[PDB]
Design a protein around this ligand. Structure first.
Ligand SMILES: Nc1ncnc2c1ncn2[C@@H]1O[C@H](COP(=O)(O)OP(=O)(O)O)[C@@H](O)[C@H]1O
Ligand SMILES: O=C(O)C1=C[C@]2(O)C=CCO[C@H](C1)[C@@H]2O
Length: 169
């Protein structure tokens, strides 16, 4: 039972915030993207490219379930995990922190040479806004807490999370 589950588009800060957040709570960080790659011995890009997204979502869903059952620290889901309904159902009852980012900032923060099957040029920004439109509702439905990561330098993001995790709502 993770202390917290982080959800958000790529660029929202799931590894930046999830590392600072897991240290602060004195527990480990688990990223389901890396967990997929450790389970399968394959890169994320190879699974998309070779087996298709539908088969990727199935490994993901099973990895997420396994992490929700097993992990006691901070768990960050890959950006599209929430599109699988059985991920959304497994998330019920958990502490879910939606990292909210704008398009322009998400795009800016994701502009390096990381391989992203669903977020490649040209028109990468237009893709990101399609991902947002599609997924923002899904993140809102599963989240038990929403945090703007736009301006906030990370340590302030984390501080906000901690004090919100401690008090009732
Ligand atoms: N609160 C923040 N402020 C500024 N930059 C951030 C913040 N959170 C993450 N970043 C930066 O944005 C990029 C994407 O970070 P990452 O944490 O991997 O996002 P995700 O893991 O959701 O894709 C990194 O270069 C990181 O330094
Ligand atoms: O937003 C996505 O669908 C994905 C985001 C990632 O977390 C990031 C990089 C590679 O693409 C897939 C799928 C990963 O799960």
């Amino acid at each position: 039972a993770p202390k917290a589950v982080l959800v958000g588009l790529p660029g929202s800060g799931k590894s930046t915030i999830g590392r600072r957040l897991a240290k602060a709570l004195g527990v480990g960080l688990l990223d389901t993207d890396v967990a997929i790659e450790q389970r399968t011995g394959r890169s994320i890009a190879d699974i998309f490219a070779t087996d298709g997204e539908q088969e990727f979502r199935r490994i993901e869903e099973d990895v997420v379930r396994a992490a929700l059952a097993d992990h006691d620290g901070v768990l960050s889901l890959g950006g599209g995990a929430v599109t699988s309904p059985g991920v959304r159902a497994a998330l019920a009852g958990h502490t879910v922190v939606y990292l909210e980012i704008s398009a322009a900032e998400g795009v800016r923060r994701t502009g390096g040479n990381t391989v992203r099957p669903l977020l490649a040029g040209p028109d990468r920004a237009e893709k990101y806004r399609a991902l947002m439109a599609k997924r923002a509702p899904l993140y809102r439905r599963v989240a038990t807490m929403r945090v703007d990561t736009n301006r906030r330098n990370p340590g302030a993001v984390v501080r906000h999370i901690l004090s919100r995790l401690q008090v009732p709502s």
